[PDB]
Amino acid sequence: MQNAYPEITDQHREFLKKQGLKVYEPKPLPDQINPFSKTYWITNAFIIGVSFLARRHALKVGAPRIFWSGCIVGVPLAAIISRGKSDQLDELVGARKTLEQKLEYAPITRRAWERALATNQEYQNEIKTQIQDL
């Protein structure tokens, strides 16, 4: 991929932030919308419990109870969709997949890349060691 837009200078963005402008940045999902957070599953458990109790009450009183039943299956049926589409590498307007996010689907490349990065890190560190010793 490329940048697709005309270039801008660092002096210009320094001037822009001096003028009071802020660079747009995607925001992380809040806890309620995050399908991997703890509050999400606490809400799911609360939903399941209240659905079961209200289903019992509806059976006792004679009201329809198939809709309370759809909430019980709805929780695990929607956890699959919410978590399933977060795993996909397709890009909407929201945010750009990083190299590490893509490497989750390439375990061989991930392992080799981590090893090579570490080895280059000791190589750079030792060269810094001699340059300090000089």
């Binding site: 837009y5 270039e7 747009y24 929201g94 750009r96």
Partner: peptide, 25 residues
């Protein structure tokens, strides 16, 4: 809400060299 988009707020600008900016091939 996981798949919902939105333009930048008032007083914000999109850096053309940022990863979130549009890209070519």
């Amino acid at each position: 809400m996981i798949s919902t988009a939105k333009p930048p707020n008032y007083g914000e600008y999109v850096d053309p060299q940022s990863p979130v900016a549009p890209k070519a091939i």
